[PDB]
Amino acid sequence: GLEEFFDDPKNWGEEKVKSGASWTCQQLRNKSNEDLHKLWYVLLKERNMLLTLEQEAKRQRLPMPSPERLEKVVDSMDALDKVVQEREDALRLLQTGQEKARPGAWRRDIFGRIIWHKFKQWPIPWYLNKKYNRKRFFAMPYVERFVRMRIEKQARIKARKRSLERKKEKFLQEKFPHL
Template sequence: SEKVTPILAVFTFSLLNKIRANINPFHQYKLIHTTLSRKGLEEFFDDPKNWGAETVKSGAAWTHEQLRCKSNEDLHKLWYVLLKERNMLLTLEQEAKRQRLPMPSPERLEKVTESMDALDKVVQERDYALRLLQTGQEYPRPGDWRKDIFGHIIWYKYKQWPIPW
């Protein structure tokens, strides 16, 4: 019994070392996303199971608060997902008009447009903050504050050439 215990302990310890060597922390892996693989013109049409349906279940539009929590890389990916979705919905809308049928769940197009507008605003906010941090300029092109012909103070952007008067 004395000889069995050390051998069992060594065997168990060697197994644990082999298992521990193969375990990597979770943060080293990127999450794998799978999408429906459609190629060619099929990407411009809705899922065939939604054809002929009067309503199609969809989620809510992305809000500014949700998008501010995302990284720039995630926002970039989301922009192209929304762009593909918008193109697909516009194709669906045009096809429904051609066939003189109502478009199923037209609010989906509004949600995608709202999401894209919110995403664009978040990216503009980040560009503004980065430009202000790096250059101290509020606007992308230098200029100065001037009075217009009505006496209102406006921001005048410098041009590459003078305007001939």
């Protein structure tokens, strides 16, 4: 069962090994859950093999046979992922109605940034937790100054990006006055 890391021995020394197109999302929306579950392993074994061949190509200072496969396979797996995820995220929207699979809150940290804080699983409730209790979600008053600076800095950047674009238009209009 160790040979699934290698292509059929009929392929070994050959430059071009041809191959099919990667799976579209659409073709995958048609398959059941079980068949996706299987296809995931068929794709896994092949991705493994391909990576093996990759490294072994680097080792021998030789170009890899038909490198493109590795791309295709990845997309397929990736695509497959996107599908299964859909069917969960649709589903939970039905059952619970939360758009996010992980519990989380909008918080304001020490630095005054407005952060999305993901939650974490603990065996004990939050007020009994030493480590969590010593985080601070809130800002002190001094921070307010820095916040302002942030805004202003941001504003500047946007401000002179805008002015740049404007300028680029004028230049072109006198270079290409086809109007």
